[PDB]
Ligand binder design. Sequence first.
Ligand code: OQA
Lengths: 99, 99
Amino acid sequence: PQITLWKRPLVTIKIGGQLKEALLDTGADDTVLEEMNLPGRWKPKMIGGIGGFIKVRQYDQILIEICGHKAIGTVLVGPTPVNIIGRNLLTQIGCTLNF
Amino acid sequence: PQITLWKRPLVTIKIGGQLKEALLDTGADDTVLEEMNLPGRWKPKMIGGIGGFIKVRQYDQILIEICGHKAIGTVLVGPTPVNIIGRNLLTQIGCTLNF
Ligand SMILES: CC[C@@H](C)[C@H](NC(=O)OC)C(=O)N[C@@H](Cc1ccccc1)[C@@H](O)C[C@H](Cc1ccccc1)NC(=O)O[C@H]1CO[C@H]2OCC[C@H]21
């Protein structure tokens, strides 16, 4: 679809069999989700933002469905204030900015 | 134009007579620019992101040109690592996400 930006671009995602709400964020290199129990192995990682850096759990090759589009890639899990879908997954679903 | 998301979506902007590079960010409510001396009154504000909050100066009704498209709104100035164009100005140039 085409999504305007009057409101936050929030969409439903499905991950690890669970539904969640997440922000499509062209300003994020990576996808970061709030604390949650994801299956599989994970590695500690740090990611930085406008306020500073946080500690996260990096999960690899995780399946996510974003408004009916499937993506398989890296998902970071940690104390983020909002679930954000970053460019690593936005590119897999064919997302572009247009104006 | 159409902007892909393989790399950070950086574009040239013109503000206060100066040219700058900035990130088109659908995950940002507000526009935040790196420290610069803009004339006029301002109000203090705190903005949050991953990692915490930073203190910024809020300027009102500032004109910005974004790839030839003009927009007028609130611009925050402070110690951000990157110049960020947020939804308050992206809506004015008719920007959409498409997939
Ligand atoms: C000016 C921004 C604030 C106004 C705005 N918050 C807001 O609107 O709250 C109401 C805001 O922070 N939004 C971010 C998403 C977000 C996070 C928390 C709460 C709401 C929304 C995102 O859109 C922009 C940042 C910009 C950036 C890029 C590079 C280095 C430092 C900072 N990207 C980012 O943090 O990305 C992370 C995750 O992936 C990694 O790539 C880049 C860095 C890594």
